């Protein structure tokens with residue numbers, strides 16, 4: 239049921255330099271069907287590969303990664319091919335390169351991300367990214383941005399509770415699209431400040447501070463009042479209080495107009 | 501299934517083996533998706549029987565946990581019927597003073613502080629026992645329906661139907677997802693116990709005016725707790741504030757809960 243045009247023989251892929259690595263295997267830069275591509279090569283695990291592919295073959299939007307195909311011939315030859323995006327991750331730009339950005343460049347990125355996410359959330363069968371962060375926002379050289387890496391992505395699912403611990407309640411509850419809005423909020427703050435949320439903490443300390451002790455990255459004069467309000471609602475502890483991505487896109491586009499006019 | 505029942509039959513001490521024909525079933529005293537709970541009679545002894553409606557794994561596990569139990573603050577297993585899946589039953593002691601839920605919310609009876617603390621302490625001990633076994637057991641369904649009361653004023657934890665033997669990038673995660681990454685720990689019972697302790701002190705069902713799922717929601721997403729009046733003694737309010745800490749790591753162990761409540765009984 240993966241449309242047959244998306245099937246790939248390994249012979250259709252030219253592998254070049256390695257560009258990423260992890261548990262799954264390796265990511266390579268390469269060439270496929272007359273394009274420059276990123277190829278995610280592989281070494282319970284098969285279900286996750288099949289999910290990712292099922293999701294990648296639904297994608298068609300300029301603010302979301304472009305799928306090229308997958309190789310399914312046998313388990314040792316598994317691979318996912320996408321367009322290569324040469325401008326790097328948003329993470330690198332802000333934290334490693336420390337390129338100084340004007341406010342217009344920042345909003346273009348954040349809007350492009352918000353649009354990609356709006357797209358995903360409003361398909362007939364909605365998609366939750368579940369891993370949205372600055373490592374998974376890639377940038378074109380022109381400053382436009384796309385949402386990448388759908389390895390954690392899932393299709394949206396269609397007495398004792400009164401005495402349940404919150405962490406237990408949360409586990410018996412369905413994972414929603416509003417969890418993507420939370421993560422986005424952090425990315426949006428991260429774009430404006432150019433700082434890693436909770437830079438001084440290791441990942442898990444940071445998550446605990448957010449979940450248990452309500453701490454949020456500090457807002458200041460670095461963030462104008464139309465946006466800062468989106469950030470606050472965006473990372474509300476109650477999912478239902480969080481805005482829809484359609485709302486996020488309009489407000490950021492309005493800000494983008496006014497910053498171009500000024 | 502046939503292999504699991506036979507293995508269970510083999511590890512289960514002989515006195516616990518029962519035939520469904522040896523059980524007399526009087527009235528219904530408990531309910532659930534699993535089946536029903538009865539008052540009844542077995543070998544001429546007044547007993548409580550859980551009757552049964554994935555279901556074999558559940559039965560083998562519940563019986564397994566039950567025959568490990570040997571502590572006066574925790575339900576006394578009497579036996580099971582494991583003849584075949586159609587006949588699945590679980591027999592325990594019957595306790596004539598009823599559930600804490602009944603006492604507080606149906607009979608609406610008034611208790612003095614000492615009587616309350618004895619209950620709270622017995623529950624705490626029972627949970628301490630479970631949590632400190634060589635193979636810890638987590639209860640997972642601790643509430644006022646599942647705390648039972650002898651007429652001498654002591655209590656036991658009952659219904660082990662939900663019980664189990666205890667076994668990125670995170671920086672950008674939503675709190676309700678970060679929490680989906682950790683499993684059910686012992687500290688989840690402590691939280692449940694906290695509400696029971698508030699329930700005992702006030703006589704009110706936690707979030708009485710909301711439906712369960714809304715109470716859960718208010719507690720998880722909005723971080724709301726039942727109000728802690730000025731009338732509640734400090735050492736107990738301290739236990740509540742900590743016991744239902746949203747941070748599991750910040751909730752006390754039951755041994756500490758026991759220790760603190762025992763002190764109060766020495767001042768009471």
Ligand SMILES: CNS(=O)(=O)c1cccc(Nc2ncnc3[nH]cnc23)c1
Pocket residue numbers: 257258265275276277278303318319320321322323324325326327376386387388389
């Ligand atoms: C392989 N397709 S994927 O599932 O979306 C995916 C997963 C993990 C990391 C990437 N990275 C990049 N992909 C493309 N271009 C780039 N330039 C700099 N990093 C990448 C992509």
Ligand SMILES: CNS(=O)(=O)c1cccc(Nc2ncnc3[nH]cnc23)c1
Pocket residue numbers: 529530537548549550575590591592593594595596597598599648658659660661
């Ligand atoms: C069958 N044993 S069980 O699984 O622990 C169990 C589960 C659910 C409810 C009970 N009730 C009572 N059990 C004993 N005495 C009582 N007096 C008033 N209600 C009960 C017992």
